[PDB]
Amino acid sequence: RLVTTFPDNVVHYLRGKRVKHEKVRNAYPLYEAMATFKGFRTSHRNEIFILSRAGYAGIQRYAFIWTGDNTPSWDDLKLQLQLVLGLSISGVPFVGCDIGGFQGRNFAEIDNSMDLLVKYYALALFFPFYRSHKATDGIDTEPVFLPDYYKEKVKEIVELRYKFLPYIYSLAL
Amino acid sequence: ILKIYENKGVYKVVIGEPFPPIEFPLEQKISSNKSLSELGLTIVQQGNKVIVEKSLDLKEHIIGLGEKAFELDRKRKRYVMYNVDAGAYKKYQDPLYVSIPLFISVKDGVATGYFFNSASKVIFDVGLEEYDKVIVTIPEDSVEFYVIEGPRIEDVLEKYTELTGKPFLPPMWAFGYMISRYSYYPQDKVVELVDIMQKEGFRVAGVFLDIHYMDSYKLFTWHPYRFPEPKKLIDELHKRNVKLITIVDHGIRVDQNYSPFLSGMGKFCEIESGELFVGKMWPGTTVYPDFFREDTREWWAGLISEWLSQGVDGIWLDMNEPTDFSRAIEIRDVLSSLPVQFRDDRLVTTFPDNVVHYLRGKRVKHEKVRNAYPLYEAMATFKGFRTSHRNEIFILSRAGYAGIQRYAFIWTGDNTPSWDDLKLQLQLVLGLSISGVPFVGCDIGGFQGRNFAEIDNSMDLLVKYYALALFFPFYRSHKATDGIDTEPVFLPDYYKEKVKEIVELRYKFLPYIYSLALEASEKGHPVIRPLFYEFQDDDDMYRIEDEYMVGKYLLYAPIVSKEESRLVTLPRGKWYNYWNGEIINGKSVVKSTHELPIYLREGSIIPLEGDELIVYGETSFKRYDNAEITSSSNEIKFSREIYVSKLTITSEKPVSKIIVDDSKEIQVEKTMQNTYVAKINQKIRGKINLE
Missing domain, CATH: 2.60.40.1180 (Golgi alpha-mannosidase II)
Incomplete structure (x- = not known):
């Protein structure tokens, strides 16, 4: 995976000084989020919403963070919980994961069963960021495409979330 | 050029001047009034390719495409139709062994079929490239496809079957319990095993003999040491009312003193430059019959007929994708030393690109007609049964193309024993079934033995396989060479009794299954069916995949997990619980009450x-x-x-x-x-x- 990072000969200008990318790499997303947040101010937009995949200390000033490209599976339920809680205990409060898992059907070790999907909705019941996201070749995971049995379960879980939204938002404040 | 012919709710669309892999007769060629736009299609001709587009609505369902390791509703995937030796396939692997370029669209409860008669590497992009479109790409400058009106899914399949061919009617014993392995030998052991099976109460319909029975893998020969007395073997099995099915590959050994090689000369596949296509297969260096030629078909029928005359009851065609290993072996020889791990590209096992055939007198590239190869081999083999005046015909094939149902049963190849495979096998056989191939099945217990860690050989899983295929048309137990012995007689009494009761229950329902087989051969209705086939108007049905209908009356919800009971989704209408007598109202979810959840429709x-x-x-x-x-x-x-x-x-x-x-x-x-x-x-x- 390290092959997907910027090469070693890349440089930036931090506070007027020329520095190597490897010395300041992790702060890159922080400064991008900062500039994007500034973009909302420039528009006199009071309701700000920014989602970021990467981050560094301070990223909480400007954005929500979701756990990226997770794989649908029973084990992933426990993994996502460790990921969001680790982020949360580290200063980044607004977090979540892709409900139903991002990965589609590009490899065998993916579990697209509907009862697992229902467990994802239930797992993130109280997560700050509650989003369903799926890859291009993954089955359609919108609740409206589920058999009535499962559709009703997702419907009741989402309604229960909205019922607790006031509490969640107070904690956000 | 664009021509459109109509008749009986079937529109034949011709783009350019097509040269079909096989010609399907049309008993009324009446020029149609409907246009492409009234048909809802867009067509484009480019660099030797034809692209056909159709819109795709959010609630629209797409089914078919035959043997696919995917959910029955095919949306959000780009499928490739190219027969290939899939090896130890896993879910979501594509393509597989069979290619049926047919898909049915169900919109607003109305079904419409689309069959593209091309055996080339056809691509079905179902709402992937464009979320709201189904794009079909045929790698040829011309092509003929058909739009088959429904409105019922059954209506589409009847017309489709009318077009490509009704399934042959096999003998009732072809649906019995078959035992097989890779392989059973020597001949005395074959009889010993059959005796133990029968003595312990298992009614065995037939036994399959895999490649170990041949002499150095040479087709139509008997191993001199393992099978020195083929007549003795044959009479003993028949004496016990057990059929004998022998495997027959497609590779002819390049052997100077091997009869088939000498007599087949002139009828083998060639390469662009004119020489014979020499490859690698079980017998080593080999050549392959060009089944696209009438004469090659006649020659093959002769060998088959001669082979059947010893008393062999059925033919099992394998590796007929067609598969070849010369490319793989070439790579393994050059990089054998290197301590690096190779990637598993299955396409390497297909015929090379320079291979040519003679179809209806015309010289064509293998890549243009590849998928129809197994169809023509099955055709010649079927002709071999006729030549022997054999009325009870039994042919099993691994690969196939539209029309294969005219000549053979199809099994899902080399599956891996595992709990997840239970669901996979169900999608595979149902996909095949909804695509015009009614007589299907899978290897009970899974083919893979112990050549890799991710194989589950537990006995309760084995029992679940027997139960899963309870109503599948083809019911055979088959296992790889290094796999544990899976015959019921080797199981502890606890498990042995369960398998025994399941097999007895199958024989108890055989009359119903066989009646459905007759219906299939007469009207083209599949034997086993996904729930949406009988209830196509209910969207919920397209998400139910661990349940299936046997005919129009029986709903079976096999237990595909370690649980003792499961949730069963019942379609609209009333259902009778076969085991306890309870009648439940449809469109509901209930808990199973028996190990074999069977419900009868009102x-x-x-x-x-x-x-x-x-x-x-x-x-x-x-x-x-x-x-x-x-x-x-x-x-x-x-x-x-x-x-x-x-x-x-x-x-x-x-x-x-x-x-x-x-x-x-x-x-x-x-x-x-x-x-x-x-x-x-x-x-x-x-x-x-x-x-």
Whole structure:
């Protein structure tokens, strides 16, 4: 995976000084989020919403963070919980994961069963960021495409979330 | 150029000047009034390619495409139709062994079929490239496809079957319990095993002989040491009423003293430059028959016929994708030393690109007609049975193309034993079934042995396989060389008894299954069906994949997990619980009450072993022996005199007595809720009344 990072000969200008990318790499997303947040101010937009995949200390000033490209599976339920809680205990409060898992059907070790999907909705019941996201070749995971049995379960879980939204938002404040 | 022909709700669209892999007759070529736009299609011709587009709505369902390791509703995936030796395939792997370029669209409850008659590497991009479109790409400058009107899915399949060919009617023993392995030998061991199986109560219909029976893998030969007395072997099995099916590959060994090689000369596949296509297969250096040629077909039929004359009862065609290993071996020889791990590109096992065939006198590239290869091999093999005046025909094929149903059964190849595979096998056989190939099955217990860690050989999983395929048309146990022995006789009594009861239950339902087979060969209706086939108007049905219908009357929800019970989704209408007698209202979810969750639909007639008969509601049914049975008000009519042993009537209203032909009255007995039994044990002229 390290092959997907910027090469070693890349440089930036931090506070007027020329520095190597490897010395300041992790702060890159922080400064991008900062500039994007500034973009909302420039528009006199009071309701700000920014989602970021990467981050560094301070990223909480400007954005929500979701756990990226997770794989649908029973084990992933426990993994996502460790990921969001680790982020949360580290200063980044607004977090979540892709409900139903991002990965589609590009490899065998993916579990697209509907009862697992229902467990994802239930797992993130109280997560700050509650989003369903799926890859291009993954089955359609919108609740409206589920058999009535499962559709009703997702419907009741989402309604229960909205019922607790006031509490969640107070904690956000 | 663009021509459109119509007739019987089937539009034949011709783009350019097509040269089909096989020609399908049209009994009325009437030029159509409907245009492409009224057909909802867009067509583009480019660099030797034809792209056909159709819109795709959010609620629209796409089914078919044959053997696909994916969910039955095919949306959000780009499929490739190219026969390939899939090896130890896993879910979501594509492509596989069979290529049926047919897909059915169900929009607003109405079904429409689309069949592209090209055996080239056709791409079906179902809402992937463009979320709201189905894009079909045919790698040829010309092509002929058909739009098949429904409106019922069954209506599309009847027309499709009418077009490509009705399934042949196989003998009843072809649906019996088959034992197989890779491989059973020497000949004395084959008989010993059959004896133990029968002695312990297992009714074995036939045994399959894999490649170890041949002499150095040479087709049409017997291993001199393992099978020195083929006649003895054959008579012993027949003496025990057991059929013998022998595997036959497609590779002819390049051997100077091998008869088939010498007699087949002139009829083998060639390469662009004119030499023979010499490759690698089980017998080593090999050449392959060009089955696209009439004469090659006649030559093959002759060898088959001669082979059948020793008393062999069936032919099992394998590796007929067609597969070749020369490329793989070439790579393994050059990089064998290197301590690096190779990638598993299955496409490397297909024929090279420079291979050519002669189709209807014309020289064509293998890549243009590849998928039809197994079809022509099966055709020639079927012709071999005719040449032998053999009425009971049995042919098993691994690969296939549209029309393969005319000549053979298809099994899902080299599956891996695992709990997840239970669900995969169900999608595979149902996909094949909804695509025109009715006689299908999978290797019970899984083919893979112990050549890699991710294989589950637990006995309770094995039992679940037997239970899963309870109603599959093809019921065979097959295992790889290094796999544990999976024959029931080697299981602890606890598990052995369970397999025994499952097999007995299958034989009890054989009459119904065989009647559905007759229906398949006459009307092209599949034997096993996904729920959406009978209830295409209910969107929920397209997400149910661990349940399947056997015919129009029986719903089976096999247990595909370690649980003791499962949730069963019942379609609209009333359903009768086969085991405890409960009748539940459709469009609901209930918990299973038995290990084998079977439910009968209101309006069912099911013939069982030993002339037994189950009737629930009003319907009409044709038994395999031509006897038609009809149930209405309180009357069961028979098209002709037939014997009836035990009659079971399920009814919410009590039944005190039945009357045979207006005179004799038979004692009725309430055995459980909604269940009434009458021990008739006598011939019935024409009717039975209920009171």
